[PDB]
Amino acid sequence: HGKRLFIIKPSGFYDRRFLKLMRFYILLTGIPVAIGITLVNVFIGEAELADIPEGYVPEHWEYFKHPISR
């Protein structure tokens, strides 16, 4: 049936534009951060705890577990 009418609604162009820009920018730095975290976890992730060797005093950053924290 050919009875299509005009739906008067406010301009939603600017809302979609802002949402697209914010998503793009968050994603722009966000995706690389996630990929790098995944690669670090898989390949170099988690240093296991061990007793300190006699006569050896460790560095201040060797008392932490996660490589990014170190």
Partner 1 sequence: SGYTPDEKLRLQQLRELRRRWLKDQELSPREPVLPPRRVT
Which spans of this chain sit near ligand CDL (rule: CB under 6 A)?
26-27, 30-31, 33-34, 37-38, 41-42, 45-46, 66
CB-nearer residue toward ligand CDL: 8 or 33: 33
Q: Could you tell me if 70 and 64 are in contact, meaning their C-beta atoms sit under 8 angstroms apart?
A: yes
**Whose structure tokens read 């995706």?**
31
Q: What is the largest CA-CA distance in the chain?
A: 90
* Residue 60 interaction partner, one of partner 1, ligand CDL, none, beta carbon < 5-8 Å per kind: none
State how far the Cα of 66 lies from the Cα of 46, in Å rounded to an integer.
Answer: 5
Stretch in the footprint of partner 1 (CB under 8 A) among 2-10, 16-24, 44-52, 53-61: 2-10
